[model samples]
Target: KPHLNLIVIGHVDHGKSTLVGRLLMDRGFIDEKTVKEAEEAAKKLGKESEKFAFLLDRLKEEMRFETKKYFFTIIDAPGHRDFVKNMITGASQADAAILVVSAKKGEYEAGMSVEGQTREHIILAKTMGLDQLIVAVNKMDLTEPPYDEKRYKEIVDQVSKFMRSYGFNTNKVRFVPVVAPSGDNITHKSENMKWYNGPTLEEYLDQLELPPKPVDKPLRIPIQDVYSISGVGTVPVGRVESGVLKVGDKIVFMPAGKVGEVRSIETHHTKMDKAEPGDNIGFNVRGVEKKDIKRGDVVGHPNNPPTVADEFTARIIVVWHPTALANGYTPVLHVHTASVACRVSELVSKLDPRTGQEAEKNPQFLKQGDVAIVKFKPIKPLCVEKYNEFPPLGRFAMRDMGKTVGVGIIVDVKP
Candidate 1:
């Protein structure tokens, strides 16, 4: 079965966790005992109707589920500014997006404004290369007149305009109205809205087309974790970003340049002969020592090793900044699974977001919403690629002061 990694994004209190719980619960992916447990816990905490959301909070793990048509990995973004680091990391790995937006009065404005997480996550998802999207217009039952189609239309129009501003094709992106707590229009059609005729959220999941596996590209697996067992050797775990991994093939960990031969490839406790793109596997490495590898290190074939960038030029948009940013401004750059401290060594030019033409030469500073080309020098060696060559390995998010300050793609890289 084809596996797709999906990430849920939205403003806090938009019901993302509840949406997840209802969608999976109706499909029987979540067990009955857990639902009961979630209800009791919610009651204990004085959360009456939010038991479904509580169910997911109790999970405390990434949801691995299967539908009739495909396999899925559901990454949840709980919508806090401090979670931006984890959000970007999750965004980079996701294939598609489900944006939960509240349709309740006042909450919609709070989430779609310039400073809202809804706007930021959409920008991050698009910058991270998620073209397909499903906007779950949730909390419909909480609207003034419960399940109002006019409210849904208004939210859709405003959201589509914003999404278009970021280059999303409105025709391709879907909008589904839902009442997650009562499970209306979650996995099945709802009688609550006679005007609505679109497919339910579960139907969309079943209809998702599996993205092409980039198995032919050169190997690049940014190691997210490394494990060591008492009897077994060191195990470095990560999803294959591109290319393939076969047992006994010698792999090089870059930005550190340590070569290790693959002894075994295991996914969910079963060993496999090879792993393709999108497969999250933990493999045993023979030569590399336990301490030599780290989370930010990448795995690749020795024949076509990962790029350890010296300095690279990139196209970036300052998403949010309290003040103007100038040269020598340093922020943590997150690419794939790696995070490195990089400095804006040079402010090359500000680009016209409309035409991609030079708007200004050597702009001294950039503020929120300004797009530009700049140079970054990593204090430590880092693995990244030009966006045109290897997108998953090339896109990045810059974070500072506990928020995503900027996001961009590598346009050029030097040794």
Candidate 2:
């Protein structure tokens, strides 16, 4: 069975958690005991309708579903501004995304504004290279008349326009009307909306095709940690970012320049002869001391070594810069599991945020809501790849003063 990671994102109070909870419950993933507990907790809080949100208050809750043909692991991401980093982390690992939007009279309009997370989430998803997107217009039952077709069409038209502006192929985007709180149009076709001929949320998910994995590519695994097991020697634990890994394979950990042989591979305490992309395993590597490898090290086959660059060129969008980003401005960059301080070596060009048209060359500075191609010199050596070649190692986040100020992808690398 093929496994696909799906993430749920939208503005807060737009029923993101509710949608997830309903999907789980309606699909038989949630047990009666869990539902009873949520109901009791909701009653204690004096808000019985808020039960669904309670089930997903914890960050990064996952549920599994197995259909006749495929399996899915749905990840529920927080929809608040403060949790944007968590959202990004979840989206980075997702194969596709489901964007939830409220269908109440004015809620959809507010969510599309600058203050809402809906637009930001869409931009992040596109930047992360997620081509499959599903827009769920939820809370249809909350309208003046339950399951209003006119209200649903209005929301779809507005959202479709914004999605196109963000460079999404409107034809490929799927829109569905749902009532998450009551579980209408989620598992089965709703008799309430006679005009909607589209498939149910479950049917659409099953119909989604999986993207091709990069198993044929060169091996690359970002080391999450190195553990000195009592008998296994130096064991590195991480998810295989790409390619394949087998016992006796010669691999090199970049940025640290440590080489070793794959002595053994084990996942969930079971020994395996080989591992593929997306498998989290702890592998014993021969000839590599525990001190030589650390977190944030990219391990790849020796034949195709990872790129170690001091400077690189990237196309970045200044999401929330306070003032302006001028030459020599420094910020901490978060890529993979590595965080390093980098200086903006040069401002190549600034482009319009909405349309990719060039606005100026060698701009003096970049302010909030500015998109620019800039060169960055890392204070220390780092392992990074071009977004086009190795996406898992190419995307990154820029943070200053404990908040993410920008996001970008590595377009070119200067080692």
Candidate 3:
């Protein structure tokens, strides 16, 4: 089955939870029993059963807190900075992102603090090497700001200007105005907004064609489990990041840097000659001692070669930090399918997240959400890809003390 990972992000109280709940309910992804459980929980809490969304939201919080897995995982990130770590944790694993902007209030209304959050998300997407983004111009039930042809033109012009800042095509971005409360432009077309003939929000998502997973690079499989089944002597399970692995193929483990050859490949007991990208299967290998490989070590083809870098350059987007990010700062860097603590070796400069324009040089600190070019050396070996080459390995998230501090793209790698 083809699976698509999407992360919904936007300002606070912008119907993120409501939209997710609606999608899950409409698609039958969640059963009626699940909805009933939420309703019952709400009633017990002395809140209206109509607010059953709290149950799902609560479930989400618990899952995040405990780090559990779910079918069709959707990270409903909170807009509050206090939950910024959760947001980063959720965003780091997403394949695509949907940015929610309030159409009624327009962009960054007078003195609104949401602009920083919105810009931060855009920059985060870029630094993570995400190329596809859909802009949901929500709350269309409010008003048609520029009613006349000239006013409409002006409004479109202004909205396009801000959209371009995030590396989005001003005219290409699929902008759909939605009213989540009334279900207009959400699951169905909005009768009230007859002037708008575009696809509904759900329709756009359903029709979205995600890009294929990358497979041209060297084979990379992060060892998640090492075990010996009843029949198989030793089995390792992981999702293939690139290239292909088949029976009898030569492989090597890095960090431990052990050499081995594949003996058998199995997915849930079915034998296969090879597995490609996105396959999570257990495979047995020969020609290498079991003690040579361990959890957290990378496995790949010996010929194509895996990487081990002590120092790497990255273009980072600052999200939420208790203090500003400056030179000589050490923050936890989470890249690829691995996480490691690294320090900022140099603060190159800052770039405007919106337009990709150079905004500052050698700044002391980056605020809530700002995109900057910085360099860092990993305390351990982290196989990262360049933004121009392998975007999947290129993107990473940084955490400090226990919370996500920033995210970035790999620009250079030094052996």
Candidate 4:
């Protein structure tokens, strides 16, 4: 079955978890016993109506499952700390996005403000390359006129305008009104909103274009983290970016070039015979020590190992850099799961972020809001790829001292 990697983002209080809980509950994705426990947990916290959110937010876990037409994997943002890492390593995996928006009177204004996390999520989503989106305008029940079509239209106008500024094509975006706690227009339409003649969230999701998976391409699993279990030995945790990984498959870790054998594969601690793209999993590997493998190492089949780039050229955008970034500027570059120090070796040319045209040739330095082609070299041997050959292994985010400087994709790699 075809599958797409998806994610949801909004300000912390938008209640996307409530929507996730409601969806899972309505679809029978979670068991009735689990629901009972969530209710008790919510009551213990003195919350009367947010029991559904408790079911989802409790774990902060991602959801992976199948529909009739396709399988979808949704990544959950674990926390706000180092969102730069999460967006590049985690959120960038998403081919589609569900943007939760608050429709409650004052809530909407708070999320839209410059200081709000919602704006950060939006811009990061664009840089991470999520083109397909669903704006779930949540909390319609709290709107001044509950379930009002006029408010829905007003939000669409406001959000779409902001999204357009970031170069998101509104054609592929769908807006659905929802009361996540009560399941209005999520799985089934709410009778309270006869005014909205739009398809339910489920219907719109089914229509989302299934992005291609490079199953036949070279195997590449960027290690997110590694562990050693008492019985299992060394285990590496990461999502399979491309190709298939099966038990007993011989794999090679890049740059370090350590070899190992896959003893087993799993998701949510459940065993699986094989893993492909869109699966977030941890696999036990034989013959590799815990110290031999670490985050940022790419795991690939022995025959087609990941490329170790000496330097690379990328189309980059400076997001929040305080001063112009010049030659010898060094910062942490997160490629896939590997964070390496990359020096801004050269600024080739500047391009307008809005228009693709070249704005200047061989620009002296890059500043915030500037887009340019830059040549950078890692201080260490790093496994990366050309964007055209493997986009998942090619994208990167540059950050300095816990702040984002820029985001980019590898256009060309020099070995």
Give me the candidate number with maximum lDDT. 1
TM-score to native of every candidate shown: 0.54, 0.55, 0.53, 0.54
lDDT by residue for model 4 (235-347), tens: 99998999999999999987888899999999998999999987888999999777878888899999999999999998777888887899899899988888999988999
After the best TM-score superposition of candidate 3, give how far the Cα of residue 69 lies from its true spot, in angstroms: 21
Candidate 1: global Cα-lDDT?
0.82
After the best TM-score superposition of candidate 1, give how far the Cα of residue 388 lies from its true spot, in angstroms: 7.0
Q: List the candidate 1 regions with Cα displacement exceeding 4 Å.
A: 28-57, 60-62, 76-92, 215-311, 314-344, 347-415
Q: Model 4, poorest ten-residue lDDT window?
A: 82-91
lDDT by residue (tens digit), candidate 1, 1-415: 7777777888889988777766565554666678788778878889766676666666656466667777777754433332333332334356667889999998888998887878877776666556678889999988889889999999999999998988976666788899888777777788999899988877777767665557988998989999997699799999998999999999999877889999999998999999999999999999998787899889999999999899999888788899999999999998899889999999999865533446799998998877788999999998899875687888899999899998887878988
1 or 2: which has the higher lDDT?
A: 1
> Each candidate's lDDT (Cα)?
0.82, 0.79, 0.65, 0.80
Ranking by TM-score: 2, 1, 4, 3
lDDT, candidate 3, 1-415, per-residue tens:
3455667776666556666665555553444566677777778887663544564475456411101122335653433332333322234356556677655554434212444556656565565445566666555556454212233234455545665765755443566767665567777787776677778876666555555446766788877778876776777788787788889998998766778888988777799999988888789977666676666567888875667767888767677786676777887777665777787887777776543435798878777677777888877776666655656567788887777677777778886
- Per-residue alpha-carbon lDDT of candidate 2 for residues 1-415, written as tens digits (9 for 90 to 100): 7887778878878987777767665553666676788788889988966667666653225476665556767753543332333333333356667889898877887788886777767776676456668888898887768778898998889878888888877776788899887777777788888899997777777777776567877888988988998876999999898899999999998887878999999999999999999999999999877787888888999989888878999888777877878999889998887888889999999865533335799999999777788899999888888876787888899999988888877878998
lDDT of 3 at 231: 71
